Every structure is written in C-alpha cells, then in structure tokens.
C-alpha cells in the first residue's frame, strides 16, 4: 500500500536491524510517522513516496500487539522541497 506525504524532519536515526544499516527520520505531518530508508537534514521540509507499513510488534511489558508504522523507502524516494 503506497503513500505520498509532506512535512518536516524532526529527528534522524542512523541505525541497524536484521543485519542491515538503515536511516530513519521522524516526519512531522500535528502527528508524526517514521520514514525508513534502507541531503535530508533536521528541519528540512520533504516530500516522501513509499510503502506504508503497519509494522505490528508485541510489547515486551504489556504483551499487547501494537502498530509501529513507517513509510518504507527502497521505487521509493525522499526529496527536499523546502
């Protein structure tokens, strides 16, 4: 399921999961969603095209299933528009 969104980068992560390095961003749209990328700076206004992932995981403490949604950029792009 594809999504096209506009907003401001509020945070940046250089991270790792499942043997792969990833860059993540917090996009403020006020709500936020994480962008996951497998010239974008803090405070940049961006347009993002990618796949909306609900990304449900079981909470360690409550043992309840929650979504941890993200836009998957692989096909996909994030372009500075500010």
């Amino acid at each position, epitope marked *: 399921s594809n999504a096209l969104m506009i907003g401001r980068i509020a*945070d940046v*992560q250089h*991270g*790792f*999961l*499942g043997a792969m390095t*990833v860059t993540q961003y917090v996009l403020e749209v006020k709500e936020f969603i*994480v962008i996951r990328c497998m010239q974008v700076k803090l405070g940049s206004r961006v347009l993002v095209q990618g796949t909306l992932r609900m990304n449900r995981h079981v909470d360690d*403490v409550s043992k309840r299933l929650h979504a*941890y949604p993200f836009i998957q950029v692989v096909l996909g792009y994030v372009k500075v528009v500010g």
Partner: nanobody
Amino acid sequence: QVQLQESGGGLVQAGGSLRLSCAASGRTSSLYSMGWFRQAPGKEREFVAAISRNGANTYYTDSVKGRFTISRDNAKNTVELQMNSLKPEDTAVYYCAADRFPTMEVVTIMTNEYDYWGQGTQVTVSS
C-alpha cells in the same frame, strides 16, 4: 528529565570479566535505543554496544564481538554489559546512553545521536 547511573566497574586482570549495569530513572517512557560507550584519556568517545527498545536487535563494535554481551530489562529500566575475556585495550571510562528516537526494533549506532548520558564508570584491565 532522564537520569542514567552506571555501576559495576573496577579493576580486573587480563582474561577476566566484569558486568556493568545502567539504571534509567525519570521520563523513561521517552527512551528507546540504549547503548554502552567508552572513552580513554585524550581520545574520542567510541561506540561499544547498543540494543533496540524491544531487545531484538543488537550491534557491537568489531573489537568486542564474541567477548561482550548487551542486554536490557524493560521492567526494571536497566541495560547491562557482560564483559568477558578482557584485554588491557578495554581500559576506559564506560558510559551508558539513551536515545529518544521513537523506534521499537531499530538500534541506534551513531554516538552523537544518543541524548542522555551517565556519569561513567572506570574499567581498568591490567596485563
């Protein structure tokens, strides 16, 4: 609004072991990725080990792989570093750190992206 406090440091002989522990207090709900770092006098602070919020993903600097193990207890708000087969090269002040970046499974591996720091604990390994 977050305090990190290390414990478990000290002196050991080469080949020995230590277990470091870090306890998080205050606004712990804001914390996600947790990590251990180290710094020797006159040197830059370096990444040692880090662990995702959910504990599923870990990352280690090359020189500690197979020797150090990071783990966390989200019910106690602690993060721990089991250090086996210690070498003189591991001598440094060790710091625990916490990242506010909101992600369940992805571990932060960039030093400057961590937001809170403990006061540090000295680890010394004699030859």
